[model samples]
Target chain A: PNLTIVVVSELLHTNWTDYVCLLESRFPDLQINIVSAPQEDALQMLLDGSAQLALMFELDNREQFVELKREALIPVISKTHPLASQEHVSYEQILGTRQIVVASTLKPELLFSKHYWRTDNHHSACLMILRNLGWGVLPQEMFKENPELNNKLKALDVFDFTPRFEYYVDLVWSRESELGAAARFLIDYIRNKRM
Target chain B: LEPNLTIVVVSELLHTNWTDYVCLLESRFPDLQINIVSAPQEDALQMLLDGSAQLALMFERDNREQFVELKREALIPVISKTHPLASQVSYEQILGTRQIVVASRTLKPELLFSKHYWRTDNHHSACLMILRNLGWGVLPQEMFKENPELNNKLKALDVFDFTPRFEYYVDLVWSRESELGAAARFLIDYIRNKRMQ
Candidate 1:
């Protein structure tokens, strides 16, 4: 069976290495292909039918995409804040501050109007502002590349803001696509993993 | 002799439950007198703004928008002490088969669904954000109101993976907009210090 999975590759935490390892271990006969792209390109590939599955963050265009499964929440923070001293930070206190957020490729306006005190597309700009005492709200995986820098930043327990948009690597396929045996198996496998 | 400090407690529940917090406060400051009152979210905001109350205990969600506009300060965060999925990185592990509920009166539902700490279906309640982040959903209060049996299904789980960080501004709102008096300031300082502990 030919299995193709599209993943958004960044320096952050949603590394495709684990999935590659799983494919090799579980089904050596299955031909697995990974197409790595930026978040925007990856989503477009899935929507355009260039790829069978897309692993990426939960973009603002949730209604447009069919999410098969997702991972759990990972809290992240800068090391300087008072919250860094604690093992976990609360949700309510995090939302209380002016937060920096990424501009979504799918629903830029909706995300900006709703979540960000301010929004910027530039990653470096966001980091600079955060370093200058501005608070940021981002996916937990986004900080994985620079764990030391993030350690310098404070991550508070945002438990109060249950259902925070920390990050989600959604397993996505077109809603209109016909599912074959391989696709079925992959979906079942993903669901089982989530369970 | 120590000066007398008047403190008011505003909450949505009945007067009896309000005393628990007040008593906690009184235990720390023996000379302080805490007056208790039961009021809704809106009423509590008004009481604080109009100088009728010194402190208010409110559901986190109801206070977010107002807190943003009012720019008040938060003194303490009240959350469950025990919860599963304490050390998990992804919220999916914690929210196994649990429905996350939210209040329809809230701002965003999808945002809560996308969070990493908790992820679940949405429910309608005052604590929508709290429920959703913990991997729950928003259901109508009537679900519990009609069938009391359903109440058990709606469990208040602790956020063990993260702390309940709230933007609750425990303000010293006075009618005159002046700084707190010496006694009130002392009481406020005492309360703030105690909260950290």
Candidate 2:
């Protein structure tokens, strides 16, 4: 039977190609179909048993999805910018500016308890704004595929005080439903992959 | 002769030959004492906010967002006019190429790719812009690493259509909260004027 994995991505941060390549290489007969859903929809799909696996940013709403593992964090910026020159930046510097925040629903709510800006649907939009020259925060790994953008913009490390979210490629099966073989295989694979 | 003028730079700049620019500035103005500090982006901003660095050569976006709460100096355009693609290249013509490779230092790829200007099977700095322009697809760095021959398939073209013509600024920034001594003012003015010439 074919296996389907639903991915909730902020445009294209998930290394879908690499993941698909590795999965196909191992399970040659297995068919993988990727469905791109927004963060909220992705969680909903997993809860509804429509998808066996959901890859998404870290969420405070733990009940929504069962996180399998943390992916790499990427710091992104424009290619021409000065911070691109660095190997890494600190969190203190990240907060000093009005950052273009990308994935906020993925972040812990404690970080923004003092601010009026709620961390929800506006995450990707914030990052989109930052990509357009607004200042924002994002995962460190996302910057790898687009180093030139970091060069044009500036990406710094999150300081001790700065807010950061742990992203997960989760194996989310309905707690109330019986698991199929394909779904069980995928969950076991992902769980072991993390180990 | 200014008694206090601090310059904050990323740690990598310290190891590179680019740091010479600071020495040259100091030599040009003997009385202008420049303190160079190497810090990560976050730390540097803390220093700036705490009154450490008076001037920062940083990403233009960082300064704009007041990441360090500093006023923007002018942005520096590093692209040379002598580049072949600088003249007579239409945006469409440039975007229609099959495969293009750019030094990982160019910023046009992400902006263009995000906008659906191009498509690629994989993500890599080398092919990001090319994939956007032609829609054929781009290969990642690992692909080129595994198969060196793929590098030959990509060409470096001069395309600037993806950049924001006006607001795309890279700058030597300064703290608005601090007073710019004569030397700091002079250096900022000098760098700004140099761009025009």
Candidate 3:
């Protein structure tokens, strides 16, 4: 079998680690090239026929796509944070508290040095909460789906903001080139299980 | 205020992204010069820490160790009138629909929109997607009212199913370690009082 390339987003590495591993377990004989990028840069690989499957956050150009499945995002604070007592926190309540932006890349390392801390991976954020550092709002897709991680943190029902950050996880592919048999089969498998 | 005053803001702000605030601060303390730029929460915080910028209005995140929190404002949810969900929009209605998340959102905005994420760096493109019925999302309520025609075109959701409430917060963050001139402090004092009217 020929190698089929798949470029994914960095968030997935922290959040959707299992989804990639699932592909490996399900199809041992298939040659899968999994590349992780910002999803912005990863799209280029898709357009150039360098990548077959893209599991990433939403992008501006959605011309090439396979399927979409929605993930839930929720806000979490250290259980010790005073605001954590609230069943739902208001926009103003979290304001006076410190804010943390956990990022692996996107040139964000230099952007938030003053008021936000930058972590190379999103998991550090959950650890930050354990340390009583500050507040972190992250996608609950992988976290919520896994009860173990979901139980470790409390969900801060935020007011005045719904669908907070951005939404959509697309299975994008190269529309110009013909997809190979293994790639198409993998796509269908993902759609069957995820969507 | 300094000879030049700058504040970083989210593009999603409904009140002309605080160009309205720019006009207000500029006029109230006429000598307090004002400038606004759309930037990610981190970039804005960096400028504040570097002391290159006067202050920043942003959503709170996990790292406020460096900033003196001044005030917080309410961010509201909105939608186009013609959209199917407009009749009775709630926080949950947004769950299954496509959401527009601009790259320059504040702390909570990113998390709020990320689960079912559609990312874009352009404000105009985001609005067009919502205006065309391609998606539904949360925007500052003031955004729709700023343009009367668009105000009629769009609407703030009447119902909030998110428990507790449908409102969220944005804050004015400044480097705690840096001292501000009297002018800069004056502007900070103003928006601290304004909130999301």
Top-TM-score candidate index: 3
Model 3 in CAPRI terms: which quality? incorrect
For model 2 chain A, the run of ten residues with the poorest summed lDDT: A113-122
Q: Would you list the C-alpha lDDT of every candidate in the order shown?
A: 0.41, 0.44, 0.53
Per-residue lDDT of candidate 1, residues A18-112 (tens digit): 55445545664554444444577666776676667777664444313434334433434456655466776555555443344434233453232
Model 2 lDDT tens row, B1-197: 22656676542122122234554564676444344543444555666667777666554434422322222222111221333343444557445432222211123654343322312211332233332222223332333432343344443334457443322223456666766677767776766666665
lDDT for A177 in candidate 2 is 52
**Candidate 2 stretches greater than 4 Å from native:** A10-12, A16-19, A26-29, A57-68, A72-97, A103-132, A157-160, A178-180, A192-195, B1-197
For each candidate, the DockQ is 0.01, 0.03, 0.02
Quote the lDDT for A9 in model 3: 31
By lDDT, rank the candidates, best first: 3, 2, 1
Model 1 per-residue lDDT tens digits across residues B1-197: 43333333222121112233343444565544333333345655666666665444554432322221122332222121223433223445444423322211123653343322222111212232232233333343332432343343345334446344423333333333523445555545655666575
lDDT over C-alpha atoms for residue A48 of model 3? 76
Candidate 3 docks with a DockQ of 0.02
Model 2 over residues A1-195: C-alpha lDDT tens digits? Answer: 455465554534545454554554566555444554556776777667666566665444334344554665434455444554577665544444323333324345434212112112222323333433324445555445434344344544544554454455654545655555655655666567766
Task: Report, to 2 decimal places, the DockQ of model 2.
Answer: 0.03
Query: Where is model 1 chain A poorest over a 10-residue stretch in terms of lDDT?
Result: A112-121
Model 2 local distance difference test score: 0.44
Using lDDT as the yardstick, the better of models 1 and 3 is: 3
